[PDB]
Amino acid sequence: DIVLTQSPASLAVSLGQRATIFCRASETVDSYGNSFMHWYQQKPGQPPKLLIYRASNLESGIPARFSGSGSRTDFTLTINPVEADDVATYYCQQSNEDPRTFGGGTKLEIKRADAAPTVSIFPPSSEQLTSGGASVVCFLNNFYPKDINVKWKIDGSERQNGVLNSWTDQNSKDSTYSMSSTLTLTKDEYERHNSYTCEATHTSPIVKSFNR
Amino acid sequence: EVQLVESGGDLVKPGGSLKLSCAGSGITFSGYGMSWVRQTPDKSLEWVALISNGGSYAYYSDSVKGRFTISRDNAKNTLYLQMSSLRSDDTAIYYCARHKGLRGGTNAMDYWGQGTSVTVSSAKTTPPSVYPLAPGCGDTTGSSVTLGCLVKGYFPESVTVTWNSSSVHTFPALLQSGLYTMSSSVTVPSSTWPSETVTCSVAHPASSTTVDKKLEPS
Ligand SMILES: CC(=O)N[C@H]1[C@H](OC[C@H]2O[C@H](OP(=O)(O)O)[C@H](NC(C)=O)[C@@H](O)[C@@H]2O)O[C@H](CO)[C@@H](OP(=O)(O)O)[C@@H]1O
C-alpha cells in the first residue's frame, strides 16, 4: 500500500503570499510517463473538490492561483496568491495502485491582525424554562487569534464545567474566528442564582453579564 | 447543472446493514469509474471502494473488504454502496465521486456528491429541541444585533440550521450525556430587527424533524 505523508500539518500564511504544501509518497506513483497524484480542497460543510489531477494539471473551473508539480515520490501544491477564501484542508491522493489512499491533510490558515471579540449573552428562553431546563449561552464573535479563554461566573464565583465550548472554522471573508460557550444547569439551580457573567480573556477581559 | 444526489444515510445498529445510493443529475456516469470515500468524525478522508465503468472491476479498502459491496446501474445513472456487518468506526459522512475518464492510466475524482451521514450505534433517535436566542425587549443595542438558535438533545449528529431574513456562524455539535447540542448565530443590522422577520430553520433528517423558530425579543 502506498502511504502518503503531507507536510506541514497546518500552515499559516498572510494574504497575498505564496503557500506551498508538500506530499511524499512511500513509493513511486509514476507509470506510463505520468504521475498519479491528485490534490483536493475541502472546506467545512462542503464536499471535497478536485484541484489538480495527475500531479500538474489544473482542473477546469478551478482558479488559476492553484498549481501543482512533482514526480515519483515528491509532490507540491502551490496557492499563489493566497486569498481569504482559501481557508480549507488540502489533500493529496494517489491512484497508481489500488487500494487508493489519501494523505492526512494540511489545514491552511490565514495570518491576520489581532481582533477582540464581540460578545453576546443570552439567558434561558422561557420556552426552555417552561420545559424544565436552563442553558445560558455566550457568543464570542469575530476575534483573532483562535486561542481565547472563556470563563463563567455565577454570583461572582467561577463555574468551571457543565460548560461546552465550540469554535467555528476560520471565516472565509475576514479571517476571524468565533465561538459559542454554553452553560447548562437545572432550572432550579438557575433560579437559585442572580448574576450570570460570560468573560473572554486573551489582561483586560471582555465581559457580558445580566441579573435575574 | 451538475449534481450527484446521495441518499440512504441513517442511524443503524452495530452488525446492521444499510444501502447508499448516488444518482447523477446533469452528468453521465457511463464511461467513467466511480468511488466511495468517507470522512470520519475526526475529519480525515478515507478511500472506501471503486468500480470500473461497466462494473467489471471492483476494489475495496482493507477496512471494508468482506463487508461492503460497491455496484452500479448505468441505465439508471446510479452508484450504490451496500453496507453490512456495520461497526462503530464505520460512522462517517459518505461521498460518492465520479472519476475523470482520461486515457493513459488512472484518474482523479472530478465530481463529488454532497455526502450522506451514517451513524452506527445502539442509541435511539431523539429529535432536537430548538430555543431562540434573542436580546430582551428593552435592551439597548447597536449597530448590529446578534441572534441565534440553540439546538439541544438530539441523536444522531446530522442536523442542518438555515437562517431566513448577514453573517452566519455555525458551531460544531458536542456530546452532552448521550445527546448532541449545537448553536448557530446570525448578525443583522439594529435597524432591521425586530421589525423585519428573522427565522432559523432546523432539520434533523434522522427523526424527520423540521423546526422553524421565529426570533422575537425577550
Ligand atoms: C487497465 C485499465 O484500463 N484500468 C482501468 C480499470 O479498468 C477496468 C476495466 O474497465 C473496463 O471494463 P468495464 O468495466 O467492462 O468497462 C475495461 N474495458 C474496456 C472495454 O475498456 C477493461 O479492459 C478493464 O479491465 O478501471 C479503473 C476505473 O474503473 C480505471 O481507473 P480510473 O477510473 O481511475 O481510470 C483504470 O485505469
Side-chain angles (χ1 to χ4, degrees):
Chain A
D1 291 16
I2 306 184
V3 176
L4 307 188
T5 301
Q6 287 184 229
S7 189
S10 61
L11 90 152
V13 156
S14 299
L15 295 174
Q17 296 199 137
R18 180 174 248 242
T20 296
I21 291 167
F22 198 74
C23 179
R24 176 81 73 188
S26 61
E27 37 182 297
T28 182
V29 295
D30 289 3
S31 66
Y32 318 118
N34 255 129
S35 298
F36 297 94
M37 188 67 86
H38 321 293
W39 293 91
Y40 302 84
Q41 179 188 63
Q42 174 158 54
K43 301 179 183 193
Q46 285 187 17
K49 174 163 27 175
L50 180 59
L51 305 170
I52 303 297
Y53 66 93
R54 291 179 174 188
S56 68
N57 309 97
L58 219 218
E59 174 71 0
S60 49
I62 299 301
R65 58 198 158 95
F66 295 93
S67 64
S69 59
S71 66
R72 281 177 30 79
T73 70
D74 70 284
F75 298 88
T76 298
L77 174 73
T78 299
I79 305 170
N80 182 225
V82 168
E83 309 197 335
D85 224 352
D86 298 331
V87 63
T89 306
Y90 292 89
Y91 296 87
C92 60
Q93 175 249 320
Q94 68 79 26
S95 60
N96 200 43
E97 205 185 65
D98 298 343
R100 303 189 184 188
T101 50
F102 288 89
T106 295
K107 273 107 147 185
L108 184 67
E109 51 194 279
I110 302 298
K111 294 187 129 270
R112 214 211 84 113
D114 281 6
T118 300
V119 10
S120 301
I121 188 163
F122 300 91
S125 59
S126 38
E127 254 216 283
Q128 193 188 16
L129 291 171
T130 296
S131 223
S135 309
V136 196
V137 177
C138 186
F139 296 125
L140 287 56
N141 289 333
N142 298 85
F143 62 84
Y144 189 96
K146 181 175 167 168
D147 253 56
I148 192 164
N149 257 245
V150 67
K151 59 180 79 181
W152 284 88
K153 300 188 201 184
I154 297 176
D155 292 321
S157 60
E158 292 180 23
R159 244 288 229 323
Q160 52 279 305
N161 240 241
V163 169
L164 279 45
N165 301 323
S166 179
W167 278 252
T168 64
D169 300 281
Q170 194 167 29
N171 185 267
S172 69
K173 301 167 182 293
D174 74 7
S175 308
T176 66
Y177 294 88
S178 293
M179 70 148 288
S180 76
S181 179
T182 308
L183 166 67
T184 310
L185 331 147
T186 312
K187 176 176 191 189
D188 289 345
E189 175 170 35
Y190 172 66
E191 295 177 340
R192 282 191 282 98
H193 299 293
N194 182 232
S195 181
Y196 292 104
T197 305
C198 87
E199 171 179 323
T201 321
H202 278 116
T203 61
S204 298
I206 300 103
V207 178
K208 280 285 156 64
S209 265
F210 68 90
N211 301 347
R212 297 211 349 297
Chain B
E1 94 191 272
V2 170
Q3 189 178 331
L4 281 61
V5 185
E6 299 191 39
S7 49
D10 209 345
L11 170 57
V12 180
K13 275 146 199 316
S17 283
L18 193 65
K19 191 167 201 167
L20 312 182
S21 279
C22 166
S25 174
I27 177 172
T28 195
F29 294 169
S30 182
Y32 301 90
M34 300 198 74
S35 282
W36 286 94
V37 353
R38 68 191 181 180
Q39 186 183 39
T40 50
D42 70 331
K43 316 286 177 265
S44 204
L45 288 175
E46 192 188 358
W47 178 83
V48 173
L50 69 76
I51 187 166
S52 64
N53 174 33
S56 296
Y57 177 101
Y59 207 101
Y60 298 93
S61 72
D62 283 326
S63 61
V64 310
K65 65 187 186 188
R67 298 188 301 119
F68 286 21
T69 308
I70 191 167
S71 59
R72 67 198 289 167
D73 182 345
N74 286 341
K76 288 201 278 219
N77 208 41
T78 304
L79 179 72
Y80 307 94
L81 187 67
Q82 174 70 59
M83 306 169 91
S84 71
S85 296
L86 281 161
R87 45 170 190 247
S88 187
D89 69 5
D90 293 317
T91 291
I93 300 169
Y94 285 76
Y95 305 101
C96 58
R98 202 198 74 180
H99 293 190
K100 292 181 74 74
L102 301 176
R103 285 177 208 290
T106 59
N107 282 274
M109 291 170 279
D110 57 355
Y111 292 100
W112 293 68
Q114 91 263 196
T116 190
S117 181
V118 177
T119 302
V120 182
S121 177
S122 293
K124 270 192 161 161
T125 302
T126 311
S129 295
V130 187
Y131 306 117
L133 306 166
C137 213
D139 217 31
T140 64
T141 68
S143 54
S144 66
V145 58
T146 301
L147 304 171
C149 285
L150 176 65
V151 186
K152 192 182 164 209
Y154 65 94
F155 189 89
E157 220 186 339
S158 166
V159 345
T160 293
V161 185
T162 309
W163 290 90
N164 197 227
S165 59
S166 316
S167 349
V168 173
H169 296 136
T170 309
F171 303 104
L174 296 167
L175 208 64
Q176 51 146 204
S177 166
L179 304 176
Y180 282 103
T181 301
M182 181 204 173
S183 60
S184 175
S185 80
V186 62
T187 295
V188 124
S190 275
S191 65
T192 84
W193 192 87
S195 47
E196 311 303 315
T197 310
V198 178
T199 293
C200 73
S201 178
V202 180
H204 180 248
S207 66
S208 232
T209 305
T210 297
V211 179
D212 263 53
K213 274 288 123 108
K214 32 191 47 162
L215 280 62
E216 303 172 3
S218 197

